[PDB]
Ligand binder design. Structure first.
Ligand SMILES: CCCC1=N[C@@H]2[C@@H](O)[C@H](O)[C@@H](CO)O[C@@H]2S1
Length: 586
């Protein structure tokens, strides 16, 4: 499944061979990043003698002159054609040609191509990821991997802003990066450039900013240093601060200054973005004028970020109208999923859903704030990419499955199993929840009512529950040993162990339900207590962060079911055999 889905696609049911011998036209005129990709896909030979013709270029290039009517007149648009006679890979601009090739790479299966005509472009101008979470910032290796992933999925934005990076936030936003870190950011910028991603470097100065000439110059001098490392897009974040830094008038003046004396002065600055102190509807003062000050005061080329009606929320038609009215421009959406920095004992690996698919025109950008777990975040990131490029065609579940199969082809069904029951956030201070384990939730619910009653269960149910636990262990063990994406396995390991132990506990609890004789029952019960203690051990020793320490898994439907069934069969036993068994699950 292409990924993101093109705006317009016509498939002829013919398929052609990737040319054994070919004629390249435009190789020296077209986007070198695109030509690179094309040349990688091709295993010789070049032939002036001909050779099937492959034409590559941007609108204006001599190579693509014949097809200029065909090229969509949109930023990052392109036209792609495959037929018996010719291949055409024509961008509206340089990024469009790179994107043509990202679609092209996906069509080529087993050295063959379908016969297709594609006219394509993004529905939202800026699409990508803000690394803007609290916690351990992404490793340098994880970032290099992200930027390549962003290029393949036509994401054009990476906003660097980890809350915990000292040279991004207070005090030390005033200081240039040390040489080591500097050389690393330089490398990130090179790699982002190669992949057609705007590396957007953010600063977060508002906690100790002085509204004086000294701090203002320090900010520009920092921006200048970042420029010298290759950075061409900038942001100033005023989120989650208090004190003098929250002053909207001073914020707008600062940003206008940066625009005027820096963004409008360098030859090639792309994005200039700001993050308001009031960044969702629920935390905005209706009677005072924070957001209208920004909307009126800020130069119209400056972006303003927004999370929707609450800190964590999905974007609605009503929600975007509300903010767009006040800021006098389309909001640049910061979506807080799958961001887990306030539910740090959970992994959030379910589908991306909830955002209205008809409001592309009402947003200038759409970025996802992810987990501190970089590779794990690729399931959502891939999905957000698909959503922000073609929201009209956005399919929740298929994109999720596509993401998983792209990330881990070798164990995709195993990863789906694991992700399916690692979706929900649990109870949290923001009240944001996701669905989890819905496949088995009716079976779970029937089975459990038919017990907390005494009314006999369904055999169908019993073996779906048992089928589930079995599948959970298979997936957990296969994942642990998977070497195709080791960094992903490393992130999820603790939850993989916990997920296995949940499945095992599940299986023993059901063996207790079929309790054949008194002492097989007690073997089961004792095994359950031992498995509980192992889960408690992991929860006490893994992921011991100061905020939500530990490791929770399958918490919405599966853990509750097992816990409740266990306390139930035990209580029936404490009355058939008049016992004193501990029925507790903590
Ligand atoms: C335009 C929104 C700016 C925001 N800043 C923080 C962010 O750093 C956290 O990652 C997120 C979830 O805890 O909560 C808020 S949202």
């Amino acid at each position: 499944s292409l990924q993101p889905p093109p705006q317009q696609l016509i498939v002829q049911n013919k398929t052609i061979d990737l040319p054994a011998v070919y004629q390249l036209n435009g190789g020296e005129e077209a986007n070198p990043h695109a030509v690179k990709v094309l040349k990688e896909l091709l295993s010789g030979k070049q032939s002036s003698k001909k050779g099937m013709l492959i034409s590559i270029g941007e609108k204006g290039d001599k190579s693509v002159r014949k097809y200029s009517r065909q090229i969509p007149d949109h930023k990052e648009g392109y036209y792609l054609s495959v037929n018996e006679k010719e291949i055409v890979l024509a961008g509206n601009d340089e990024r469009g040609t790179y994107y043509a090739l990202q679609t092209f790479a996906q069509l080529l299966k087993d050295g063959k191509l379908p016969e297709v005509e594609i006219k394509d472009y993004p529905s939202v101008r800026y699409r990508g990821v803000v690394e803007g979470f609290y916690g351990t910032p992404w490793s340098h290796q994880a970032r290099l991997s992200q930027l390549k992933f962003y290029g393949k999925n036509k994401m054009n934005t990476y906003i660097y802003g980890p809350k915990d990076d000292p040279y991004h936030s207070a005090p030390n936003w005033r200081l240039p990066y040390p040489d080591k870190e500097a050389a690393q950011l330089q490398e990130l910028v090179a790699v982002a450039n190669e992949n057609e991603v705007d590396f957007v470097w953010a600063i977060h100065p508002g906690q100790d900013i002085k509204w004086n000439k000294e701090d203002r110059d320090l900010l520009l001098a920092k921006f200048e240093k970042m420029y010298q490392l290759g950075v061409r897009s900038f942001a100033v974040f005023f989120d989650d601060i208090s004190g003098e830094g929250t002053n909207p008038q001073k914020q707008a003046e600062l940003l206008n200054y940066i625009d005027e004396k820096f963004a409008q002065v360098k030859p090639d600055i792309n994005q200039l973005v700001m993050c308001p102190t009031e960044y969702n509807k629920s935390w905005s003062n209706p009677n005072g004028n924070y957001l209208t000050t920004l909307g009126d005061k800020l130069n119209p080329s400056i972006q303003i970020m927004w999370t929707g009606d609450r800190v964590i929320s999905d974007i609605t038609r009503d929600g975007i109208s509300w903010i767009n009215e006040r800021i006098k421009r389309p909001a640049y959406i910061w979506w807080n999923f799958p961001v887990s920095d306030y539910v740090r004992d959970h992994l959030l690996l379910g589908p991306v859903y909830g955002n209205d698919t008809t409001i592309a025109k009402e947003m200038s950008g759409f970025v996802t704030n992810p987990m501190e777990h970089a590779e794990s975040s690729k399931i959502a990131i891939y999905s957000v990419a698909s959503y922000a490029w073609n929201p009209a065609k956005y399919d929740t579940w298929q994109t999720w499955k596509d993401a998983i199969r792209t990330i881990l082809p070798s164990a995709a069904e195993e990863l789906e199993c694991f992700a399916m029951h690692n979706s929900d956030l649990g109870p949290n201070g923001h009240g944001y929840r996701r669905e989890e384990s819905m496949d088995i939730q009716p079976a779970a619910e029937r089975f459990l009512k038919a017990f907390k009653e005494g009314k006999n269960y369904d055999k169908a149910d019993f073996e779906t529950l048992q089928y589930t636990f079995e599948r959970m262990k298979e997936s957990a063990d296969i994942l642990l040993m998977n070497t195709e994406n080791k960094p992903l396995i490393v992130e999820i390991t603790p939850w993989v162990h916990q997920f296995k132990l949940t499945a095992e506990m599940g299986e023993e609890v059901l063996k207790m339900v079929e309790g054949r004789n008194e002492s097989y029952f007690l073997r089961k019960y004792n095994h359950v207590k031992a498995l509980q203690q192992q889960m408690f051990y992991i929860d006490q020793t893994s992921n011991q962060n100061p905020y939500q320490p530990g490791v929770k898994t399958a918490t919405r439907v599966i853990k509750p079911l097992i816990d409740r069934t266990f306390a139930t069969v035990v209580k029936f036993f404490n009355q058939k055999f008049n016992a004193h068994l501990d029925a507790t699950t903590d």
